[PDB]
Amino acid sequence: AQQSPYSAAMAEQRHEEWLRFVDLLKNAYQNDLHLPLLNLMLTPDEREALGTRVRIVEELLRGEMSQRELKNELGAGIATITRGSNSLKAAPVELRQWLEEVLL
Amino acid sequence: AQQSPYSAAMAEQRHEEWLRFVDLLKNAYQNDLHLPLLNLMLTPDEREALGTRVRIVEELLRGEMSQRELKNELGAGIATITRGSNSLKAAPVELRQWLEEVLL
Amino acid sequence: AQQSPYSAAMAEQRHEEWLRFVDLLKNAYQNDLHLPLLNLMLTPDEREALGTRVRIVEELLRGEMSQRELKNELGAGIATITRGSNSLKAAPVELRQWLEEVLL
Amino acid sequence: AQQSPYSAAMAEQRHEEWLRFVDLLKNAYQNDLHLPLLNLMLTPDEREALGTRVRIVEELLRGEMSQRELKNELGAGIATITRGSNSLKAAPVELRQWLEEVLL
DNA sequence: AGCGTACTAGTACGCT
DNA sequence: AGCGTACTAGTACGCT
Ligand SMILES: N[C@@H](Cc1c[nH]c2ccccc12)C(=O)O
Ligand SMILES: N[C@@H](Cc1c[nH]c2ccccc12)C(=O)O
Ligand SMILES: N[C@@H](Cc1c[nH]c2ccccc12)C(=O)O
Ligand SMILES: N[C@@H](Cc1c[nH]c2ccccc12)C(=O)O
Protein backbone atom coordinates (compact mmCIF):
# COMPACT_ATOMS: atom_id res chain seq x y z
CA ALA A 1 0.00 0.00 0.00
CA GLN A 2 1.55 2.99 -1.07
CA GLN A 3 -1.45 4.49 -2.45
CA SER A 4 -1.98 1.71 -4.94
CA PRO A 5 -0.98 3.57 -8.57
CA TYR A 6 -0.85 0.32 -10.60
CA SER A 7 0.88 3.30 -12.86
CA ALA A 8 3.62 1.94 -15.15
CA ALA A 9 4.45 5.62 -14.86
CA MET A 10 6.45 5.44 -11.32
CA ALA A 11 6.09 1.77 -10.08
CA GLU A 12 9.63 2.11 -11.44
CA GLN A 13 11.14 4.43 -8.81
CA ARG A 14 9.75 2.62 -5.82
CA HIS A 15 12.12 -1.02 -8.22
CA GLU A 16 15.56 0.41 -8.49
CA GLU A 17 15.18 1.36 -4.78
CA TRP A 18 14.17 -2.18 -3.94
CA LEU A 19 17.32 -3.42 -5.73
CA ARG A 20 19.31 -1.05 -3.63
CA PHE A 21 17.89 -2.91 -0.60
CA VAL A 22 18.62 -6.29 -2.09
CA ASP A 23 22.26 -5.23 -2.55
CA LEU A 24 22.68 -3.66 0.87
CA LEU A 25 21.28 -6.77 2.53
CA LYS A 26 23.75 -8.72 0.46
CA ASN A 27 26.63 -6.86 2.06
CA ALA A 28 25.02 -7.14 5.44
CA TYR A 29 25.16 -10.91 5.17
CA GLN A 30 28.76 -10.79 4.32
CA ASN A 31 29.62 -8.52 7.21
CA ASP A 32 27.42 -10.37 9.66
CA LEU A 33 25.24 -7.35 10.09
CA HIS A 34 22.19 -8.86 8.44
CA LEU A 35 20.33 -9.49 11.69
CA PRO A 36 20.43 -5.94 13.00
CA LEU A 37 19.83 -4.65 9.50
CA LEU A 38 16.70 -6.73 9.20
CA ASN A 39 15.61 -5.58 12.65
CA LEU A 40 16.05 -2.02 11.46
CA MET A 41 14.41 -2.51 8.05
CA LEU A 42 11.39 -4.74 8.87
CA THR A 43 8.71 -4.35 11.50
CA PRO A 44 8.15 -7.09 14.09
CA ASP A 45 4.97 -8.09 12.29
CA GLU A 46 6.71 -8.50 8.93
CA ARG A 47 9.37 -10.71 10.44
CA GLU A 48 6.73 -13.00 11.93
CA ALA A 49 4.61 -13.21 8.74
CA LEU A 50 7.86 -14.21 7.03
CA GLY A 51 8.45 -16.94 9.57
CA THR A 52 5.06 -18.42 8.69
CA ARG A 53 5.65 -18.19 4.94
CA VAL A 54 8.84 -20.20 4.99
CA ARG A 55 7.07 -22.98 6.91
CA ILE A 56 4.22 -22.89 4.47
CA VAL A 57 6.52 -23.03 1.48
CA GLU A 58 8.63 -25.78 3.03
CA GLU A 59 5.68 -28.00 4.01
CA LEU A 60 3.98 -27.50 0.72
CA LEU A 61 6.99 -28.72 -1.24
CA ARG A 62 7.30 -31.47 1.37
CA GLY A 63 3.74 -32.45 0.67
CA GLU A 64 3.52 -34.74 3.69
CA MET A 65 0.38 -33.09 5.09
CA SER A 66 -2.89 -31.82 3.65
CA GLN A 67 -3.27 -28.03 3.53
CA ARG A 68 -5.95 -28.24 6.17
CA GLU A 69 -3.42 -29.85 8.52
CA LEU A 70 -0.74 -27.27 7.72
CA LYS A 71 -3.24 -24.55 8.60
CA ASN A 72 -3.85 -26.15 11.98
CA GLU A 73 -0.26 -26.70 12.81
CA LEU A 74 0.61 -23.07 11.96
CA GLY A 75 -2.60 -21.44 13.17
CA ALA A 76 -2.91 -19.92 9.71
CA GLY A 77 -5.90 -19.03 7.53
CA ILE A 78 -6.32 -21.25 4.53
CA ALA A 79 -6.01 -18.13 2.36
CA THR A 80 -2.39 -17.82 3.43
CA ILE A 81 -1.55 -21.38 2.36
CA THR A 82 -3.20 -20.73 -1.03
CA ARG A 83 -1.04 -17.59 -1.47
CA GLY A 84 2.01 -19.75 -0.89
CA SER A 85 0.66 -22.46 -3.15
CA ASN A 86 -0.05 -20.14 -6.08
CA SER A 87 3.25 -18.27 -5.66
CA LEU A 88 5.13 -21.53 -5.60
CA LYS A 89 3.42 -22.43 -8.91
CA ALA A 90 4.93 -19.28 -10.40
CA ALA A 91 8.41 -19.70 -8.95
CA PRO A 92 11.12 -20.59 -11.47
CA VAL A 93 11.99 -24.26 -11.84
CA GLU A 94 15.49 -23.50 -10.55
CA LEU A 95 14.14 -22.00 -7.35
CA ARG A 96 11.61 -24.73 -6.68
CA GLN A 97 14.17 -27.46 -7.09
CA TRP A 98 16.82 -25.68 -5.00
CA LEU A 99 14.22 -25.18 -2.25
CA GLU A 100 13.34 -28.87 -2.19
CA GLU A 101 17.00 -29.46 -1.40
CA VAL A 102 17.87 -26.95 1.20
CA LEU A 103 14.43 -26.93 2.77
CA LEU A 104 14.02 -30.74 2.67
CA ALA B 1 -1.40 -9.32 11.94
CA GLN B 2 -1.28 -12.90 13.25
CA GLN B 3 -3.52 -12.69 16.29
CA SER B 4 -1.20 -10.17 18.15
CA PRO B 5 -0.40 -11.93 21.39
CA TYR B 6 2.75 -10.33 23.01
CA SER B 7 2.42 -13.91 24.38
CA ALA B 8 5.71 -14.94 25.93
CA ALA B 9 3.93 -18.15 25.01
CA MET B 10 5.07 -18.83 21.44
CA ALA B 11 6.66 -15.69 20.09
CA GLU B 12 9.62 -18.08 20.10
CA GLN B 13 8.34 -20.48 17.44
CA ARG B 14 7.39 -17.86 14.94
CA HIS B 15 10.68 -16.33 15.84
CA GLU B 16 12.44 -19.59 15.12
CA GLU B 17 10.40 -19.74 11.83
CA TRP B 18 11.64 -16.26 11.01
CA LEU B 19 15.28 -17.39 11.61
CA ARG B 20 14.63 -20.23 9.20
CA PHE B 21 13.87 -17.47 6.66
CA VAL B 22 16.96 -15.50 7.49
CA ASP B 23 19.07 -18.63 6.89
CA LEU B 24 17.38 -19.65 3.64
CA LEU B 25 17.80 -16.15 2.21
CA LYS B 26 21.42 -16.43 3.26
CA ASN B 27 21.82 -19.47 1.06
CA ALA B 28 19.86 -17.79 -1.73
CA TYR B 29 22.31 -14.95 -1.96
CA GLN B 30 25.15 -17.40 -1.99
CA ASN B 31 23.54 -19.31 -4.84
CA ASP B 32 22.41 -16.20 -6.65
CA LEU B 33 18.77 -17.08 -6.26
CA HIS B 34 17.96 -14.30 -3.83
CA LEU B 35 16.10 -12.22 -6.37
CA PRO B 36 13.50 -14.82 -7.30
CA LEU B 37 13.32 -15.98 -3.69
CA LEU B 38 12.48 -12.47 -2.56
CA ASN B 39 9.99 -12.19 -5.41
CA LEU B 40 8.39 -15.38 -4.14
CA MET B 41 8.51 -14.49 -0.43
CA LEU B 42 7.44 -10.81 -0.41
CA THR B 43 4.46 -9.08 -2.02
CA PRO B 44 5.02 -6.23 -4.54
CA ASP B 45 3.99 -3.75 -1.93
CA GLU B 46 6.43 -4.98 0.71
CA ARG B 47 9.22 -4.72 -1.81
CA GLU B 48 8.33 -1.14 -2.54
CA ALA B 49 7.90 -0.06 1.11
CA LEU B 50 11.34 -1.53 1.64
CA GLY B 51 12.75 0.57 -1.17
CA THR B 52 11.52 3.68 0.58
CA ARG B 53 12.88 2.65 3.95
CA VAL B 54 16.40 2.24 2.68
CA ARG B 55 16.21 5.76 1.30
CA ILE B 56 14.87 7.13 4.52
CA VAL B 57 17.49 5.37 6.58
CA GLU B 58 20.24 6.45 4.22
CA GLU B 59 19.19 10.11 4.09
CA LEU B 60 18.75 10.30 7.81
CA LEU B 61 22.28 9.06 8.51
CA ARG B 62 23.49 11.39 5.77
CA GLY B 63 21.63 14.17 7.48
CA GLU B 64 22.14 16.67 4.67
CA MET B 65 18.38 17.41 4.26
CA SER B 66 15.54 18.19 6.70
CA GLN B 67 12.89 15.55 7.23
CA ARG B 68 10.33 17.85 5.53
CA GLU B 69 12.55 17.74 2.44
CA LEU B 70 13.10 13.97 2.64
CA LYS B 71 9.32 13.56 2.76
CA ASN B 72 8.82 15.58 -0.42
CA GLU B 73 11.67 13.85 -2.24
CA LEU B 74 10.22 10.42 -1.36
CA GLY B 75 6.50 11.29 -1.47
CA ALA B 76 6.25 9.78 2.01
CA GLY B 77 4.25 10.73 5.09
CA ILE B 78 6.22 12.31 7.86
CA ALA B 79 5.16 9.41 10.09
CA THR B 80 7.24 7.01 7.99
CA ILE B 81 10.36 9.15 8.44
CA THR B 82 9.78 9.22 12.22
CA ARG B 83 9.53 5.40 12.22
CA GLY B 84 12.91 5.28 10.52
CA SER B 85 14.33 7.90 12.85
CA ASN B 86 13.22 6.16 16.03
CA SER B 87 14.27 2.75 14.71
CA LEU B 88 17.70 4.09 13.89
CA LYS B 89 17.97 5.43 17.47
CA ALA B 90 17.43 1.84 18.63
CA ALA B 91 19.84 0.23 16.14
CA PRO B 92 23.16 -1.06 17.50
CA VAL B 93 26.16 1.23 17.37
CA GLU B 94 27.83 -1.37 15.11
CA LEU B 95 24.99 -1.26 12.61
CA ARG B 96 24.64 2.55 12.51
CA GLN B 97 28.37 3.03 11.98
CA TRP B 98 28.61 0.37 9.19
CA LEU B 99 25.54 1.79 7.46
CA GLU B 100 27.26 5.19 7.47
CA GLU B 101 30.13 3.56 5.56
CA VAL B 102 28.41 1.48 2.94
CA LEU B 103 25.41 3.76 2.74
CA LEU B 104 27.50 6.97 2.56
CA ALA C 1 13.58 17.08 18.73
CA GLN C 2 17.03 18.05 20.01
CA GLN C 3 19.12 17.90 16.82
CA SER C 4 18.42 14.11 16.20
CA PRO C 5 21.90 12.74 16.03
CA TYR C 6 21.84 8.90 16.51
CA SER C 7 25.38 10.12 17.45
CA ALA C 8 27.17 7.46 19.45
CA ALA C 9 28.86 10.75 20.36
CA MET C 10 26.90 12.03 23.35
CA ALA C 11 23.68 9.99 23.53
CA GLU C 12 25.21 8.97 26.86
CA GLN C 13 25.24 12.43 28.57
CA ARG C 14 21.63 13.23 27.75
CA HIS C 15 21.06 9.64 28.74
CA GLU C 16 22.80 10.25 32.03
CA GLU C 17 20.72 13.48 32.39
CA TRP C 18 17.63 11.39 31.80
CA LEU C 19 18.77 8.98 34.63
CA ARG C 20 19.11 12.05 36.90
CA PHE C 21 15.39 12.61 36.22
CA VAL C 22 14.46 9.03 36.93
CA ASP C 23 16.25 9.24 40.31
CA LEU C 24 14.78 12.61 41.25
CA LEU C 25 11.25 11.45 40.51
CA LYS C 26 12.05 8.37 42.65
CA ASN C 27 12.76 10.64 45.59
CA ALA C 28 9.67 12.69 44.80
CA TYR C 29 7.42 9.67 45.10
CA GLN C 30 9.06 8.80 48.41
CA ASN C 31 8.46 12.26 49.77
CA ASP C 32 5.03 12.60 48.23
CA LEU C 33 6.06 15.44 45.96
CA HIS C 34 5.71 13.51 42.74
CA LEU C 35 2.54 15.18 41.71
CA PRO C 36 3.91 18.74 41.70
CA LEU C 37 7.24 17.56 40.35
CA LEU C 38 5.46 15.96 37.42
CA ASN C 39 3.39 19.12 36.95
CA LEU C 40 6.58 21.09 36.85
CA MET C 41 8.46 18.73 34.61
CA LEU C 42 5.88 17.80 31.94
CA THR C 43 3.64 19.97 29.82
CA PRO C 44 -0.23 19.54 29.91
CA ASP C 45 -0.18 17.77 26.64
CA GLU C 46 2.46 15.18 27.65
CA ARG C 47 0.49 14.36 30.73
CA GLU C 48 -2.62 13.72 28.66
CA ALA C 49 -0.85 11.65 25.96
CA LEU C 50 0.50 9.57 28.84
CA GLY C 51 -2.97 9.05 30.18
CA THR C 52 -4.00 7.58 26.78
CA ARG C 53 -0.95 5.40 26.53
CA VAL C 54 -1.62 3.63 29.83
CA ARG C 55 -5.11 2.88 28.58
CA ILE C 56 -3.87 1.55 25.31
CA VAL C 57 -1.24 -0.61 26.97
CA GLU C 58 -3.72 -1.87 29.55
CA GLU C 59 -6.41 -2.72 27.02
CA LEU C 60 -4.06 -4.46 24.63
CA LEU C 61 -2.74 -6.79 27.38
CA ARG C 62 -6.31 -7.34 28.45
CA GLY C 63 -7.05 -8.16 24.84
CA GLU C 64 -10.83 -8.14 25.35
CA MET C 65 -11.59 -5.62 22.61
CA SER C 66 -10.40 -5.17 18.99
CA GLN C 67 -8.03 -2.29 18.22
CA ARG C 68 -10.76 -0.64 16.12
CA GLU C 69 -12.81 -0.60 19.34
CA LEU C 70 -9.99 0.67 21.51
CA LYS C 71 -9.51 3.49 19.08
CA ASN C 72 -13.16 4.58 19.33
CA GLU C 73 -13.28 4.24 23.08
CA LEU C 74 -10.15 6.44 23.41
CA GLY C 75 -10.77 8.76 20.50
CA ALA C 76 -7.25 7.89 19.27
CA GLY C 77 -5.79 7.30 15.82
CA ILE C 78 -5.04 3.71 14.96
CA ALA C 79 -1.40 4.67 14.56
CA THR C 80 -1.19 5.38 18.32
CA ILE C 81 -2.48 1.87 19.20
CA THR C 82 0.07 0.34 16.83
CA ARG C 83 2.85 2.28 18.59
CA GLY C 84 1.64 0.77 21.85
CA SER C 85 1.34 -2.68 20.31
CA ASN C 86 4.79 -2.67 18.80
CA SER C 87 6.27 -1.18 21.98
CA LEU C 88 4.72 -3.90 24.03
CA LYS C 89 6.25 -6.48 21.70
CA ALA C 90 9.64 -5.08 22.56
CA ALA C 91 9.01 -4.85 26.38
CA PRO C 92 10.85 -7.35 28.60
CA VAL C 93 8.91 -10.47 29.57
CA GLU C 94 9.21 -9.35 33.23
CA LEU C 95 7.49 -6.06 32.47
CA ARG C 96 4.64 -7.49 30.36
CA GLN C 97 3.86 -10.11 32.97
CA TRP C 98 3.88 -7.64 35.91
CA LEU C 99 1.71 -5.21 33.94
CA GLU C 100 -0.77 -8.07 33.41
CA GLU C 101 -0.96 -8.38 37.16
CA VAL C 102 -1.24 -4.81 38.42
CA LEU C 103 -2.97 -3.55 35.27
CA LEU C 104 -5.45 -6.47 35.14
CA ALA D 1 -1.44 17.95 21.01
CA GLN D 2 -4.39 16.00 21.07
CA GLN D 3 -6.33 18.18 18.94
CA SER D 4 -6.04 21.12 21.27
CA PRO D 5 -9.92 21.40 22.86
CA TYR D 6 -8.98 23.84 25.65
CA SER D 7 -12.75 22.37 26.46
CA ALA D 8 -13.43 22.19 30.22
CA ALA D 9 -15.90 19.74 28.75
CA MET D 10 -13.38 16.56 28.41
CA ALA D 11 -9.87 17.88 29.42
CA GLU D 12 -11.15 15.85 32.37
CA GLN D 13 -11.05 12.34 30.89
CA ARG D 14 -7.64 12.66 29.33
CA HIS D 15 -6.79 13.86 34.16
CA GLU D 16 -7.98 10.80 35.95
CA GLU D 17 -6.18 8.73 33.30
CA TRP D 18 -3.00 10.69 33.98
CA LEU D 19 -3.38 9.88 37.73
CA ARG D 20 -3.67 6.26 36.80
CA PHE D 21 -0.21 6.62 35.23
CA VAL D 22 1.22 8.42 38.21
CA ASP D 23 -0.02 5.54 40.39
CA LEU D 24 1.21 2.77 38.11
CA LEU D 25 4.68 4.37 37.95
CA LYS D 26 4.58 4.50 41.72
CA ASN D 27 4.22 0.79 41.94
CA ALA D 28 6.81 0.33 39.23
CA TYR D 29 9.36 2.12 41.39
CA GLN D 30 8.52 -0.15 44.27
CA ASN D 31 8.92 -3.31 42.30
CA ASP D 32 11.96 -2.02 40.40
CA LEU D 33 10.19 -2.09 37.06
CA HIS D 34 10.20 1.65 36.60
CA LEU D 35 12.95 1.61 33.98
CA PRO D 36 11.27 -0.77 31.57
CA LEU D 37 7.91 0.82 32.30
CA LEU D 38 9.36 4.21 31.37
CA ASN D 39 10.88 2.71 28.25
CA LEU D 40 7.52 1.36 27.30
CA MET D 41 5.59 4.54 28.16
CA LEU D 42 7.86 7.31 26.80
CA THR D 43 9.42 7.74 23.40
CA PRO D 44 13.21 8.12 23.14
CA ASP D 45 12.79 11.81 22.37
CA GLU D 46 10.70 12.43 25.51
CA ARG D 47 13.27 10.78 27.73
CA GLU D 48 16.05 12.95 26.29
CA ALA D 49 14.01 16.15 26.57
CA LEU D 50 13.50 15.18 30.23
CA GLY D 51 17.19 14.76 30.83
CA THR D 52 17.77 18.35 29.63
CA ARG D 53 14.96 19.73 31.75
CA VAL D 54 16.30 18.35 34.99
CA ARG D 55 19.70 19.88 34.25
CA ILE D 56 18.04 23.16 33.44
CA VAL D 57 16.03 23.13 36.67
CA GLU D 58 18.99 22.06 38.77
CA GLU D 59 21.36 24.72 37.31
CA LEU D 60 18.80 27.48 37.55
CA LEU D 61 18.25 26.83 41.25
CA ARG D 62 22.03 26.52 41.60
CA GLY D 63 22.33 29.90 40.01
CA GLU D 64 26.09 29.58 39.48
CA MET D 65 25.95 30.34 35.74
CA SER D 66 24.16 32.86 33.53
CA GLN D 67 21.39 31.44 31.36
CA ARG D 68 23.38 32.16 28.31
CA GLU D 69 26.08 29.84 29.71
CA LEU D 70 23.59 27.12 30.65
CA LYS D 71 22.34 27.26 27.09
CA ASN D 72 25.81 26.65 25.74
CA GLU D 73 26.71 23.88 28.10
CA LEU D 74 23.47 22.01 27.23
CA GLY D 75 23.26 22.97 23.58
CA ALA D 76 19.78 24.29 24.29
CA GLY D 77 17.74 27.17 22.87
CA ILE D 78 17.26 30.04 25.21
CA ALA D 79 13.52 29.47 24.96
CA THR D 80 13.92 26.12 26.76
CA ILE D 81 15.70 27.70 29.79
CA THR D 82 12.93 30.38 29.99
CA ARG D 83 10.30 27.58 30.07
CA GLY D 84 12.23 26.13 32.97
CA SER D 85 12.61 29.49 34.61
CA ASN D 86 8.96 30.39 34.41
CA SER D 87 7.83 26.94 35.54
CA LEU D 88 10.10 27.07 38.49
CA LYS D 89 8.52 30.39 39.40
CA ALA D 90 5.19 28.66 39.55
CA ALA D 91 6.40 25.62 41.48
CA PRO D 92 5.16 25.31 45.13
CA VAL D 93 7.48 26.58 47.80
CA GLU D 94 7.74 23.01 49.16
CA LEU D 95 8.97 21.67 45.85
CA ARG D 96 11.45 24.44 45.20
CA GLN D 97 13.07 24.01 48.54
CA TRP D 98 13.13 20.21 48.43
CA LEU D 99 14.76 20.50 44.95
CA GLU D 100 17.47 22.77 46.26
CA GLU D 101 18.38 20.01 48.64
CA VAL D 102 18.35 16.86 46.58
CA LEU D 103 19.53 18.59 43.36
CA LEU D 104 22.18 20.67 45.09
C1' DA E 1 -16.35 -11.86 7.34
C1' DG E 2 -13.08 -9.57 11.02
C1' DC E 3 -8.63 -7.94 12.57
C1' DG E 4 -3.79 -6.06 13.13
C1' DT E 5 -0.76 -2.95 11.30
C1' DA E 6 2.17 0.13 7.74
C1' DC E 7 1.05 3.65 5.09
C1' DT E 8 0.08 8.78 3.01
C1' DA E 9 -2.36 13.23 4.91
C1' DG E 10 -1.28 17.12 7.65
C1' DT E 11 -1.71 18.74 12.45
C1' DA E 12 0.56 20.59 17.11
C1' DC E 13 4.24 21.52 19.79
C1' DG E 14 9.05 21.26 22.18
C1' DC E 15 13.19 22.13 20.69
C1' DT E 16 17.65 24.78 18.86
C1' DA F 1 12.75 31.55 12.16
C1' DG F 2 13.52 26.23 11.34
C1' DC F 3 13.28 21.41 12.75
C1' DG F 4 12.17 16.79 14.84
C1' DT F 5 8.53 14.09 16.25
C1' DA F 6 3.81 12.37 18.49
C1' DC F 7 -0.55 12.93 17.25
C1' DT F 8 -5.65 12.34 15.01
C1' DA F 9 -7.49 11.09 10.02
C1' DG F 10 -8.43 7.12 7.40
C1' DT F 11 -6.27 4.24 3.81
C1' DA F 12 -4.47 -0.65 2.03
C1' DC F 13 -3.41 -5.10 2.72
C1' DG F 14 -1.68 -9.72 4.95
C1' DC F 15 -3.45 -12.33 8.11
C1' DT F 16 -6.79 -15.86 10.75
N1 LIG G 1 11.84 -1.73 12.52
C1 LIG G 1 11.05 -0.62 11.95
C2 LIG G 1 10.70 -0.91 10.50
C3 LIG G 1 10.27 0.25 9.78
C4 LIG G 1 9.00 0.60 9.53
N2 LIG G 1 8.97 1.76 8.81
C5 LIG G 1 10.25 2.17 8.59
C6 LIG G 1 10.73 3.28 7.91
C7 LIG G 1 12.08 3.44 7.85
C8 LIG G 1 12.96 2.51 8.46
C9 LIG G 1 12.48 1.42 9.12
C10 LIG G 1 11.10 1.24 9.20
C11 LIG G 1 9.79 -0.52 12.75
O1 LIG G 1 9.37 -1.58 13.24
O2 LIG G 1 9.25 0.60 12.89
N1 LIG H 1 4.91 -13.41 -3.40
C1 LIG H 1 3.84 -13.84 -2.49
C2 LIG H 1 4.22 -13.53 -1.06
C3 LIG H 1 3.41 -14.23 -0.09
C4 LIG H 1 2.37 -13.73 0.58
N2 LIG H 1 1.86 -14.67 1.42
C5 LIG H 1 2.60 -15.82 1.29
C6 LIG H 1 2.47 -17.04 1.93
C7 LIG H 1 3.36 -18.01 1.60
C8 LIG H 1 4.37 -17.78 0.64
C9 LIG H 1 4.49 -16.58 0.01
C10 LIG H 1 3.58 -15.57 0.33
C11 LIG H 1 2.62 -13.07 -2.85
O1 LIG H 1 2.79 -11.94 -3.32
O2 LIG H 1 1.50 -13.61 -2.68
N1 LIG I 1 8.14 3.75 23.79
C1 LIG I 1 6.97 4.10 22.98
C2 LIG I 1 6.19 5.23 23.63
C3 LIG I 1 4.86 5.40 23.06
C4 LIG I 1 4.47 6.30 22.12
N2 LIG I 1 3.13 6.13 21.83
C5 LIG I 1 2.64 5.10 22.60
C6 LIG I 1 1.36 4.57 22.68
C7 LIG I 1 1.16 3.55 23.55
C8 LIG I 1 2.20 3.05 24.34
C9 LIG I 1 3.46 3.57 24.26
C10 LIG I 1 3.70 4.62 23.39
C11 LIG I 1 7.47 4.58 21.64
O1 LIG I 1 8.58 5.18 21.62
O2 LIG I 1 6.75 4.35 20.64
N1 LIG J 1 5.79 22.27 33.10
C1 LIG J 1 6.76 22.76 32.10
C2 LIG J 1 7.50 21.61 31.47
C3 LIG J 1 8.68 22.03 30.75
C4 LIG J 1 8.80 22.23 29.41
N2 LIG J 1 10.07 22.66 29.11
C5 LIG J 1 10.79 22.74 30.27
C6 LIG J 1 12.12 23.10 30.49
C7 LIG J 1 12.58 23.07 31.77
C8 LIG J 1 11.74 22.69 32.83
C9 LIG J 1 10.44 22.33 32.62
C10 LIG J 1 9.94 22.35 31.32
C11 LIG J 1 6.02 23.49 31.01
O1 LIG J 1 4.87 23.06 30.72
O2 LIG J 1 6.62 24.44 30.45
Side-chain angles (χ1 to χ4, degrees):
Chain A
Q2 303 188 198
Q3 152 97 192
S4 45
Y6 315 129
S7 88
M10 205 14 70
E12 297 97 303
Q13 180 198 157
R14 16 233 321 178
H15 180 238
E16 269 57 278
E17 310 201 307
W18 153 253
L19 298 178
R20 218 164 314 187
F21 172 71
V22 175
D23 272 9
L24 179 72
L25 183 53
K26 177 161 157 301
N27 274 31
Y29 271 107
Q30 299 206 306
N31 281 271
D32 249 307
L33 287 165
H34 44 104
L35 234 25
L37 177 72
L38 290 166
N39 277 349
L40 164 66
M41 303 291 307
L42 300 178
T43 71
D45 204 81
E46 294 172 327
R47 293 194 287 277
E48 296 171 7
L50 282 163
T52 296
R53 308 179 186 166
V54 297
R55 283 291 308 254
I56 284 171
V57 162
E58 150 194 5
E59 302 288 356
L60 279 181
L61 288 180
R62 200 152 167 291
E64 200 194 345
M65 52 182 83
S66 58
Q67 281 177 12
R68 252 75 127 249
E69 285 183 50
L70 222 203
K71 131 202 178 176
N72 273 293
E73 220 209 338
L74 286 40
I78 190 75
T80 306
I81 273 85
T82 302
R83 282 191 86 143
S85 183
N86 286 333
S87 296
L88 216 42
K89 289 176 196 163
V93 166
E94 303 60 56
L95 181 70
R96 285 212 303 292
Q97 75 184 211
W98 169 85
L99 288 175
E100 295 174 328
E101 300 187 358
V102 309
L103 271 188
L104 311 190
Chain B
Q2 285 123 238
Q3 180 58 206
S4 67
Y6 318 130
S7 67
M10 208 0 89
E12 289 104 293
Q13 187 197 148
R14 287 194 140 149
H15 181 234
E16 269 64 283
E17 316 200 304
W18 153 251
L19 296 182
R20 214 172 314 202
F21 172 69
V22 174
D23 286 353
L24 180 71
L25 183 54
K26 179 158 153 306
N27 282 29
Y29 274 107
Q30 301 194 306
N31 288 271
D32 265 296
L33 286 165
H34 42 107
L35 236 22
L37 178 71
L38 288 168
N39 281 349
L40 163 68
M41 300 299 286
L42 300 177
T43 73
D45 216 72
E46 294 175 327
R47 288 195 290 278
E48 289 175 19
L50 279 165
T52 294
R53 306 179 185 166
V54 295
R55 281 298 303 268
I56 285 170
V57 165
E58 158 186 359
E59 297 298 334
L60 285 180
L61 287 182
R62 201 151 166 301
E64 201 189 344
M65 49 176 80
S66 66
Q67 286 177 9
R68 226 74 112 254
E69 297 181 48
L70 222 204
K71 141 202 162 181
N72 270 278
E73 229 200 324
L74 283 45
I78 194 78
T80 307
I81 274 84
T82 300
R83 283 191 86 143
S85 181
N86 285 335
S87 295
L88 219 37
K89 288 176 201 163
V93 164
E94 304 74 73
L95 182 65
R96 292 208 298 281
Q97 74 181 208
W98 164 83
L99 286 178
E100 300 178 334
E101 300 181 6
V102 311
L103 271 194
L104 316 182
Chain C
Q2 286 124 237
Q3 183 60 202
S4 57
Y6 318 134
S7 58
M10 212 351 81
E12 294 101 298
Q13 180 194 157
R14 286 203 139 142
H15 181 234
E16 274 60 284
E17 314 199 309
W18 154 249
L19 296 180
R20 219 170 308 204
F21 173 71
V22 171
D23 288 351
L24 181 70
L25 183 56
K26 177 161 159 304
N27 283 29
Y29 272 105
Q30 304 195 306
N31 288 271
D32 264 304
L33 286 167
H34 43 104
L35 237 26
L37 180 68
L38 287 173
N39 279 349
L40 165 65
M41 300 298 290
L42 301 174
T43 73
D45 217 69
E46 297 173 328
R47 288 195 292 276
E48 288 176 17
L50 281 165
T52 292
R53 303 184 185 164
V54 292
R55 281 297 305 267
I56 285 168
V57 166
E58 158 187 357
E59 297 296 340
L60 285 177
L61 288 182
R62 202 151 166 301
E64 199 184 347
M65 44 177 88
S66 71
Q67 288 177 9
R68 225 71 112 255
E69 294 184 50
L70 225 200
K71 142 198 163 184
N72 270 278
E73 226 201 321
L74 283 43
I78 195 74
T80 308
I81 275 82
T82 301
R83 283 192 87 142
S85 182
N86 283 341
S87 294
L88 221 37
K89 287 180 202 158
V93 163
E94 307 67 80
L95 184 66
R96 294 208 297 277
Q97 75 181 205
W98 164 81
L99 287 175
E100 299 178 331
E101 301 184 4
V102 311
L103 272 190
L104 314 182
Chain D
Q2 303 188 198
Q3 152 96 192
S4 45
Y6 315 129
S7 88
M10 205 14 70
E12 297 97 303
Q13 180 198 157
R14 16 233 321 178
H15 183 234
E16 272 57 277
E17 309 203 303
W18 153 251
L19 296 171
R20 223 166 311 185
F21 172 75
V22 173
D23 272 6
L24 182 71
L25 186 52
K26 179 159 156 305
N27 277 32
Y29 271 107
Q30 299 208 303
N31 285 264
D32 252 304
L33 287 165
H34 44 106
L35 237 22
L37 178 70
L38 291 167
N39 271 355
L40 166 63
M41 303 294 305
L42 301 175
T43 68
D45 206 79
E46 296 174 330
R47 291 192 291 275
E48 296 169 12
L50 284 159
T52 296
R53 304 184 184 164
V54 292
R55 284 289 310 259
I56 281 172
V57 161
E58 148 195 9
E59 300 290 353
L60 280 178
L61 286 179
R62 200 156 168 288
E64 201 197 342
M65 51 182 79
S66 62
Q67 281 177 15
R68 252 75 130 244
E69 286 182 47
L70 224 204
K71 137 199 174 181
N72 272 299
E73 220 208 334
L74 283 44
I78 192 75
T80 308
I81 276 83
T82 305
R83 282 192 85 141
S85 187
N86 286 337
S87 299
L88 214 42
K89 288 179 195 158
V93 166
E94 301 56 49
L95 183 68
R96 281 210 305 287
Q97 72 182 217
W98 169 81
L99 287 177
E100 291 176 334
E101 303 183 359
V102 312
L103 273 188
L104 315 189

